[PDB]
Amino acid sequence: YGRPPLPPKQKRK
């Protein structure tokens, strides 16, 4: 499976 990349932060209010 490996190490998936860090997800983007959507930063919605």
Partner 1 sequence: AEYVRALFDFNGNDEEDLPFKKGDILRIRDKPEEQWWNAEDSEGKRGMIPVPYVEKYR
Instruction: Please report, as ranges, the residues that interact with partner 1 according to CB under 8 A.
Output: 3-10, 12
Q: What is the CA radius of gyration of the chain?
A: 11
At 8, is the secondary structure helix, strand, or coil? coil
**Smallest separation, CB 4 to partner 1 (Å):** 4
**Smallest separation, CB 9 to partner 1 (Å):** 6
Q: What is the DSSP letter of 2?
A: -
**Smallest separation, CB 5 to partner 1 (Å):** 8
Q: Which two three-digit tokens encode residue 4?
A: 């998936």
